[PDB]
Homo-oligomer: 279 residues x 5
């Protein structure tokens, strides 16, 4: 029944609708392959000679993905609760607000998360980093290739200024696409560049030869290019557990809720990122 | 039943639809928190160690809002009334006109209101100022910070001319956003700039990195930046009282109507304003 | 029942839909004030002190409008009629044509009419001038002020050429707006400039402020600025009279029709016109 | 019943939908007047004096239009017929194709047709010229005025090059409109310029002050300006005769079909053309 | 019943919807003519003289098309199958994915296929070439004319650089259209240019005088111009044979499927291509 809530959350936010979310009933295994393209068409002599052998479309290679839990937990005083109850039919109003906050927090944790560690903190981490391992960290860790942090081997700051390595940013994206992406991945019909809020320069008209799209939260001075169906998140089906209760202590009612999730990029050779950009 | 009329008025005008209006049944208390965002997601060892404590989303800090009444009151002669009655089914026509006028007057009183005082006047105040305390005055009074009236400490005229402090206005909005707004408020997905009619320069295409929108009435040489859901108005539920009657004196029929309202900005750290702009 | 036909005629053409037309049952009196906006909100001590006095919204001042009749009259030969009677449902094919022509004639007579006089001529007046008094003539006659036609007192040819008084047109628009319109009328959600065809300069076409719009027929070298709901036409309800003849005269079936109308601007403070523009 | 087929054909193509087609039951007579505009409104003393006389809207002047027949006739082999029959429900497919071809051929014959002559040929006339008299030839023949083939009286090549008479083409269209069109035809609300494919220069954005539209086939170095309701075609109602039959000779099935049509421009003073343009 | 699946596949992808697919029940014969235009209208004396002879619209000239089979064949492990089955109603999900892959692979094989040969390979041919003969190869083989690989007779590299033959690409497309296309094919109302991904230069706004459209896979440094209804593919009706089965060997379930298809361009004189472009 958790799939109903998960699909509701996915529909609630636009960005998540462009991404896929699948429930896996086990804990640690191998991942489904969606963003794979190939030339499955062929022909061969089937009369007096060789025989035809098929070709997979799964591309399983070193995933060993494992899922961990995260929990959202909050509380409300009684005065605020009564003020909300004064609203006409606030039952839907509260639900929509909490759903929207959870959906936004998913992405905020996803894009710039790194180094999952117990006993998370919200003092030194305004943006939540140590809550789970993210897509960017997944690239930066599992495949140390296909990332441009250095230049070739001088200072590892890819600059675009006066003495810039790539004075024009479209030339940079062209070089990245032509160098660190597979040939039959070059001309894919739905490749998209993800960039933050500072590097926009006000123009989703076009960039290089690929459409652009921004996200709510994203590390500045960092860019990515991939299909908007490659990356995804997995959530264990029968692990969503919530409980609400009030306590006369400090006159509040609180709720706790926990799910088991893990971010995962399906294909590695489709999509590269760059970091440490100046200007 | 007043909520029906209030929602009708809100729907009648487009701008008010983008804003929220909630009925509070008490007079003076604490305010609901809507425009609040945070990283409620976390993780911590729940087996053999610490325990998890939730986190509020209310952010109550020094509101002490109090509501006052305002009343609209007018009259019509008999000749104009009969001429209106000559129209085919004018009953809806009159109602729509008065609703539109009330809705527009709400905003006109809201944006540039200051220093609520009894015995309002319409001679020295073409625009109504002393009718109620407005959002701009609320910022300028409750939080003396997050407002740029001076320069740093030379003349307090933020100029954009030849010897201008900010020759380019987009640089000004960038500086304001980066300086007087909270970090996790910087990249919010629905931040909007409010500007009057003179500072438009003909271009809602784009400004800086934020979309722009104008309002019917607004103080010239003044600009604001915030979410279009932060600010709001509160109206006491059981306080709307109206009465109509005719008097043979000077051959007229008049009506009086009074409501209890108060403008309120939900979050202060989300949204800053600037005043006294030259060119 | 004439109101049904009048409403059909109004709905037929687009420009007339943006304008208001009303049946008046009397002949000469005071006008209905639709397009006016005043701050009706206020507040005053009603306990131990003064009392609250309402505020009208009519602002009637020296209106004194008087209606006059105009009549249409035409005829068709039997040959053209028999040819028309060939289509499937020729009735609508004729009705829509005559309705559209009558509406176009209404607009033409409205915009550049002057000095109503009996025994109208169609030789010396290609465009119909002496048929009725138009909005432009109404401004030029009733309010001799609030019309910009001279320079200050040299030649009254407002030029925008090389040595022009206002080499840039939008500067002239801003000057006229800020010098001839009321303060609380300087900004309004629908203030629009009307201009002819030759003065368009190819750029509806977004202009600096007051988004422009053209009309079918309009005097060149003249411009107006007002709300598209300010001006209007009034028609006497029970005065529409038509009659048909099929005469054994030379060869024809003719028809005559007559209505009683009068053009009227609702408020003079909202809207100014400029004439005799060079270049 | 032919009107059903004619309306089907008119709806099939977009361009013909913007034009009118009327069935006339006689052969040679006078033409219906649609694209006529005038000031039918007037006023005159009907009490003690003159009487009011109506005004026609037919404008009959020297039409004497006469209709001639044209016939389409083709054939298909049996192999192609069976291959078509292999398609799923090809009965509609064949009909749509032949309707589209007939509709396109109507226009192709219309725009650049001249000098109707029996025994048409398809060797020396790739584009069909001698099939019927066209709109362009109708202007060039019936009204020798309102056409600019010469300059005033030097070489009759209206050039736009270096030593061009009209270096700017919009100036040319402005001059043509102001010179060879009637005054009350100048500002008509639906005037349109027709131009071929070579003179487009890639920009229906705007040209001069009139919208532009291209047609499938059109003589290069030729331009026209008129209302898209002035010109039209007439077709005799009870003259459409078709017959299909197969003949074992050369293994084919053929069909012949004949209609009686004639192109006609309604008003001459509304719309002028220019020819022999260089660059 | 195969037509249901074929139409489903055609609808699944947008590009194939703009193209036609017809089932032929024989193996090798003559092709249907769709993209043919002509002046079928004519006129001739049918009384006392010659007789009228119709004109074909088939244009059969040297097609001799022959169809060959291609087969798609793949397999899935059991773990991936169970993971897919965990999804809610994956039966449609798998079908949509395989349909999309087949549809894309059709085009990828079509545009840059050459020299059909048995025992296809996927090592030295990342893009599949020897699977079937494609449209480009069809032009380059059957009609050695209407292709610009050389210059006139210097180096056969049509360059656009500094010393370029055609410095401007629109001039190149204009020259190609005016030279290697038939006159009555020049002004066709739906001519379109096909270009790859590198030669886009970011601008489907417009190119030359024709609209542009890109395709997923296309040979770089190659361009084509034709109607989007000229080319097509033929598929034998009763030849689609598929079979699925599992084998405990290496724990997999596989499927094989074979169809009989052949690409074919309907008209040769409508549409030309150019290859070997520099810059």
């Amino acid at each position: 029944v958790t799939q109903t809530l998960m699909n509701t959350m996915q529909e609630s936010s636009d960005f998540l609708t462009r991404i896929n979310i699948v429930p896996v009933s086990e804990m640690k295994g191998e991942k489904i392959g969606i963003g794979v393209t190939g030339s499955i068409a062929s022909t061969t002599d089937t009369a007096g000679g060789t025989e035809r052998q098929p070709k997979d479309f799964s591309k399983l290679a070193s995933n060993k993905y494992e899922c961990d839990q995260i929990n959202f937990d909050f509380y409300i005083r009684y005065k605020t609760l009564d003020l909300w109850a004064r609203y006409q039919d606030f039952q839907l109003r509260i639900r929509n607000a909490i759903i929207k906050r959870q959906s936004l927090d998913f992405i905020m944790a996803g894009f710039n998360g790194v180094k999952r560690a117990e006993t998370s903190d919200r003092s030194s981490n305004p943006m939540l980093q140590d809550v789970a391992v993210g897509w960017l960290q997944k690239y930066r860790n599992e495949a140390p290739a296909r990332v441009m942090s250095k230049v070739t081997t001088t200072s590892e700051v890819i600059r675009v200024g006066k003495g810039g390595d790539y004075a024009s940013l479209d030339a940079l994206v062209m070089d990245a696409t032509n160098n660190l992406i597979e040939p039959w991945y070059q001309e894919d019909p739905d490749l998209v560049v993800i960039v933050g809020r500072q590097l926009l320069a006000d123009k989703q008209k076009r960039i290089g030869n690929l459409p652009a799209v921004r996200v709510p939260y994203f590390p500045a001075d960092a860019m990515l290019i991939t299909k908007l169906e490659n990356l995804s998140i997995y959530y264990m089906d029968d692990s969503h557990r919530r409980v609400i209760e009030e306590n006369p202590k400090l006159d509040r009612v609180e709720n706790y809720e926990s799910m088991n999730i893990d971010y995962v990029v399906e294909d590695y050779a489709a999509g590269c990122l760059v970091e440490k950009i100046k200007v």
